[PDB]
């Protein structure tokens with residue numbers, strides 16, 4: 001019955017308003033591969049709004065690997081990993097990720113989002129504590145919520161705040177600190193040396209979410225612990241397959257005894273169907289390519305350094321990024337919607353960040369690089385961004 | 395740091411014990427397609443532990459559709475649906491599911507589990523209430539937990555308990571009832587006529603989880619509302635693609651204004667990468683086949699009726715199922731582990747249900763039918779199950 005439910009959604013008018021103003025640019029239907037150019041409504045659009053950092057969703061070897069897995073294993077496993085849903089190729093990918101991130105063992109999840117729900121929901125319990133960076137990814141907040149522990153946020157990369165909040169807690173309790181490695185909104189990196197130094201003093205477990213770090217930072221792209229040399233001070237390395245690795249799914253890696261607890265206790269792996277064979281095979285082949293072919297990570301960083309230099313040279317106001325995510329400040333929700341739509345209609349795809357996710361005065365567009373971007377494409381997009389910023393008067 | 399984390403997992407000894415006794419049969423690595431026979435450790439094993447009710451993960455048209463989508467769209471969308479992750483084929487599948495279940499609109503999620511997290515986390519809020527059947531799927535409990543509402547369980551299919559608990563609640567609050575359509579453990583069907591009659595009296599929203607109903611009950615397999623004629627008394631129809639539809643992902647369907655709220659407010663769609671092209675194309679082609687080819691659902695039910703008759707004729711003690719899920723009672727955790735392992739080693743795959751998921755005295759094995767099963771295969775499995783039940787002394 002719909003009376004009260006109608007009242008619950010009645011106040012949500014922003015989508016109605018965007019559409020009526022001709023500004024709506026969410027759920028843009030793409031008709032082509034995710035690439036440096038995408039087809040929308042039969043037109044070509046430069047893509048600077050992707051998380052495919054290495055451009056690998058179009059790699060013919062990864063496509064063929066997925067196509068070959070479909071031929072061999074079919075379209076799905078039709079069950080959870082713990083029952084009828086495990087393949088030899090799931091185990092092969094867990095061994096290969098374990099090796100890549102320098103951990104004993106790993107467990108796959110069918111999404112990155114579910115990869116965070118697993119360890120955050122089931123390791124800390126009643127009388128325990130989870131400490132979260134206040135800018136942690138939504139999946140980390142939600143995972144923590146599914147625990148029976150007390151969830152405490154600390155100031156973004158604020159090590160004094162972390163230390164103070166940990167010092168307040170009963171000695172006779174377990175604590176786990178979970179942080180994004182690279183934070184997607186502003187593209188900044190966790191202070192993992194100070195965080196792990198505090199974790200060690202309070203015997204708190206450390207989990208890092210490397211969704212935006214894998215294939216971006218660390219040796220051969222192995223992530224944030226690898227970037228800092230701190231493998232031995234990080235208990236759990238969580239990753240996704242939906243960004244550099246050009247697929248769908250994720251993993252948590254760590255000590256064999258912890259991973260064995262997780263694979264048997266995490267509801268998001270016990271009660272959700274396993275990764276499709278095609279996604280396992282595309283993840284396996286992408287992981288081989290990132291290691292074997294250092295070109296991809298090098299070119300991603302050539303493009304990032306070029307684009308960032310060009311944007312600062314044109315007088316754009318950039319967020320404190322340390323990654324291929326280049327946040328461009330606009331500081332008006334209405335201009336941010338207008339700029340996004342004008343760029344879309346001129347053939348540039350960027351992602352807006354607006355209220356209520358951020359305060360109006362910190363509203364921005366995110367311009368993300370891929371390894372397969374050319375300097376010609378970056379130049380065309382920045383030229384159009386200068387024109388649209390001028391028309392929008394920012 | 396690992397001191398307190400080591401203590402948290404220290405008491406979890408059942409996996410150690412199963413493995414040392416030679417009884418461990420979780421995460422069995424399959425080397426072949428999910429089919430009526432699977433290859434494990436180079437051997438052939440009859441599969442009666444799957445959720446692929448229509449046998450469609452091996453259908454060459456669905457494999458080719460997925461392979462063709464990989465060729466056209468590549469291995470992944472590399473973003474959330476609301477940003478850079480929407481394809482024309484996602485929208486096509488939402489229109490086609492909307493039509494199938496007789497609703498205005500639908501929104502896809504990259505897993506079934508995330509399909510429940512979406513509406514349960516974001517429609518009811520502070521001062522609102524969610525009413526859950528106590529046997530609801532884990533993803534429904536977890537979704538409800540992510541809400542800011544008061545979550546209340548009612549007795550399994552206990553309409554007096556539902557009615558009493560709803561009658562206790564402030565009039566000036568929104569309420570949503572969420573139920574599995576077919577409950578997977580025992581295979582029983584919700585009393586949707588009485589539940590919707592109560593919902594209508596209290597103006598409570600109704601959401602049904604049809605994970606195990608789609609492709610099983612209702613007209614052309616359209617689910618539980620369709621089974622009862624009650625489309626107009628169900629606000630939200632949730633489904634998965636990981637069972638009959640032979641893929642990965644899920645959806646919520648309902649009124650265009652509700653679905654528009656969801657697609658813009660549910661964290662499990664805003665903050666998780668979209669379904670891979672291969673999974674969209676395999677879901678689209680499976681949905682065409684289930685409707686166009688009534689054979690599949692007919693044969694699933696021929697097999698279910700045959701197997702259930704044969705099991706009752708052999709004196710097995712069956713759960714109160716109304717579905718292709720045939721729960722066989724064992725009523726000892728140790729015998730349930732032993733029976734499962736002995737059957738595995740004799741070439742029969744069944745799923746055990748043990749403590750702490752159920753009380754020891756209700757421990758059982760779940761024997762699930764697929765349309766592609768033969769009577770010869772069902773006979774071989776039941777023959778082996780009689781022998782193993784005799785050896786195990788149950």
Ligand SMILES: Cc1ncc(COP(=O)(O)O)c(/C=N/C(CO)(CO)CO)c1O
Nearest residue numbers: 080271272273505506507531605634636
């Ligand atoms: C009622 C219901 N609702 C939602 C889900 C979650 O769907 P999925 O994530 O596609 O596995 C399941 C998953 N079910 C299992 C097999 O039964 C694990 O419980 C995994 O697919 C379910 O049974």
Ligand SMILES: Cc1ncc(COP(=O)(O)O)c(/C=N/C(CO)(CO)CO)c1O
Nearest residue numbers: 111112113137211240242474665666667
């Ligand atoms: C730090 C972090 N952690 C976990 C996730 C969830 O991973 P996935 O489910 O694969 O999208 C994301 C997803 N990120 C987006 C694009 O940034 C949406 O937030 C979707 O892939 C993430 O950024």
